[PDB]
Amino acid sequence: DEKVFTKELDQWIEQLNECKQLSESQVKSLCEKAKEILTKESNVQEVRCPVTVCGDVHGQFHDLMELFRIGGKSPDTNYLFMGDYVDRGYYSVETVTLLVALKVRYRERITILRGNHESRQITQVYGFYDECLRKYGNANVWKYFTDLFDYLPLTALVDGQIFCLHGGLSPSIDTLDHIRALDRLQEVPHEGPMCDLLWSDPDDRGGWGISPRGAGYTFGQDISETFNHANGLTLVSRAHQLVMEGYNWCHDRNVVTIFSAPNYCYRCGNQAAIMELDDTLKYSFLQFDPAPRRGETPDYFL
């Protein structure tokens, strides 16, 4: 909110747009400011009608630019992400830094949720701790980012008609008040409502089922319909599931899975999509292909 601080934040955003990382002290200051900003949102986030919804990015920074080119620049176009910024990518640090900087700089225009991969255990199992070690020489920036990930809001609510979340519903959750009652200022547990909100998936089995991934549950069309009718919702936007077309409609068009990382892991070769909500809350899907690539040390060296 202060003049020179905002100018420095704009400089940081411009530098990040060139796929350039920030210094450790800069990351520390940005993480502290982001923690102060995010400490004052509830578990559910109120988002206005005109906003663009994007799914998992997973550290593909050039792909995120391509997404920005497709959907408009960050300040001009309202955006809403539902997690999974750092894993399975070669620029996870840059991706999370850019997204968090946008959240700090444009808090009324950028709304970033919490995905299952923004947790200490998963980010240690997969390649973000190693990525941070390679890019910084120590494990301080990783600690800052993991601590910041705790304060991220679990879900978001746009115009009180659309429910935005990463994983899906839980057997122990049935009402937005119950979602509000949860405590999110902690590492995600191995089980419970908070873990279930970020790890669940939809299927065509009906009722609550065991998740093959190892955490969360699987909810059916009946569960989605009763949740929608109880909470007065017409659409539940979700992520965390890979889809070839980029977007997928399930459970009689009650939930939608949006994936914004085409050519997943640079191996899948899929397409992506984003959800644009206009003034009258009419959804539109834009599909885009991965950005073209131009410009084509021992592990014990330290």
């Binding site: 200490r120 240690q124 494990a139 892991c265 640079y266 191996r267 592990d299 330290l302």
Partner: protein, 373 residues
């Protein structure tokens, strides 16, 4: 068919069959072309395989050259460009294998060659003038093929060739050493490292007790540098087995092996660090008490950092060393100078960890250390 034919032109019918199947067909451009010609040649190859494993006294001096020539024309080729993309952002363990299109024929050729090598009447003295250093080099060149079944068949064939041919042993070892040198220092991309290491381990199992300088230098400068490659997770079990095999063959190499492992310790690869810890424990279960006292200082200096690392997987892997009774018992034998190296590391992370299982393991290890002395 051979079985219905009379017995006095058998060799000629067999040689005609080996002259057949030497023609190469196309499976990539057209997969439904010359179906009859493919089926008859496949039937001929299967007939050869069934015959050479059942009939006796049927291998003559005139069959070896036709066999090696047919194998050469059918298999000795230049490998196609790799379909898997190469780069720093691609995980070496995620490369989907590219199956060979001509497998329905290559598998039969491999099976025929394996049975011919394993035939009871196979004569190495006669066969050595056809299978030569050029044949061995051509066979070793095919180990980079992306087909796992082709790699397995090549591994079995190479093992049989080494076992039966005494004069090609040094040449085979030198060629494998050259391939490993190239993979380590120039290319860092090879699909047959695991099979080559399996062959080399089976080779190690038969080394003489007075270990030779050649084998010692091979261990010091080939197996040890193999730990520094980015794709170490693909072939780590085989490399660990080879290192343990050398350790059990000669216990005087434990200090060089451990000091090399600590030298190549990864610092930006948590799975590689976990594999290093696993291999270090495997080496340590067979270390001698006298030799342990000579490398324990650097060993525990590295183990302190392994215990103190924020990564939970490596922390628990380092903490699991306490469940092994040998390491703990020999720690007590060197407690006077083991205590101050490791005590600060265990004490400083008593409660400073994001994981509670790590807290429990650290408390258990600390209580075990306290009860020691």
């Amino acid at each position: 068919a051979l079985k219905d034919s009379p017995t006095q032109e058998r060799e000629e019918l067999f040689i005609q069959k080996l002259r057949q199947c030497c023609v190469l067909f196309d499976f990539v451009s057209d997969p439904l072309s010359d179906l009859k010609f493919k089926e008859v040649k496949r039937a001929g190859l299967n007939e050869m395989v069934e015959y050479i494993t059942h009939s006796r006294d049927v291998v003559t001096e005139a069959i070896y050259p036709e066999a090696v020539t047919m194998f050469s024309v059918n298999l000795f080729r230049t490998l196609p460009p790799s379909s898997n993309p190469t780069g720093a952002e691609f995980d070496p363990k995620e490369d989907e294998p590219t199956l060979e299109a001509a497998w329905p024929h290559l598998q039969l050729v491999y099976e025929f060659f394996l049975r011919f090598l394993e035939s009871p009447d196979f004569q190495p003295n006669i066969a050595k003038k056809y299978i030569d250093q050029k044949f061995v080099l051509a066979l070793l060149d095919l180990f980079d093929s992306e087909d796992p079944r082709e790699r397995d068949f090549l591994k079995t064939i190479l093992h049989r060739i080494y076992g039966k041919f005494l004069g090609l042993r040094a040449y085979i070892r030198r060629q494998i050493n050259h391939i490993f040198y190239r993979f380590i220092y120039e290319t860092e991309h090879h699909n047959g490292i695991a099979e080559l290491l399996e062959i080399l381990g089976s080779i190690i199992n038969g080394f003489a007790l007075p270990l030779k300088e050649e084998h010692k230098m091979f261990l010091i400068r080939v197996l040890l540098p193999l730990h520094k490659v980015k794709s170490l997770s693909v072939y780590h079990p085989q490399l660990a087995y080879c290192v343990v095999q050398f350790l059990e063959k000669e216990s005087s190499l434990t200090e060089p092996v451990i000091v090399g492992l600590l030298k190549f310790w990864p610092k930006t690869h948590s799975p590689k660090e976990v594999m290093f810890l696993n291999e270090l424990e495997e080496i340590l279960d067979v270390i001698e008490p006298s030799e342990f006292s000579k490398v324990m200082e650097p060993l525990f200096r590295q183990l302190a950092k392994c215990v103190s690392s924020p990564h939970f997987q490596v922390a628990e892997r380092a903490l699991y060393y306490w469940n092994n009774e040998y390491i703990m018992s020999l720690i007590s034998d060197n407690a006077a100078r083991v205590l101050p190296i490791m005590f600060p590391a265990l004490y400083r992370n008593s409660k400073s960890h994001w994981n509670k299982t790590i807290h429990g393991l650290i408390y258990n290890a600390l209580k075990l250390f306290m009860e020691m002395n």
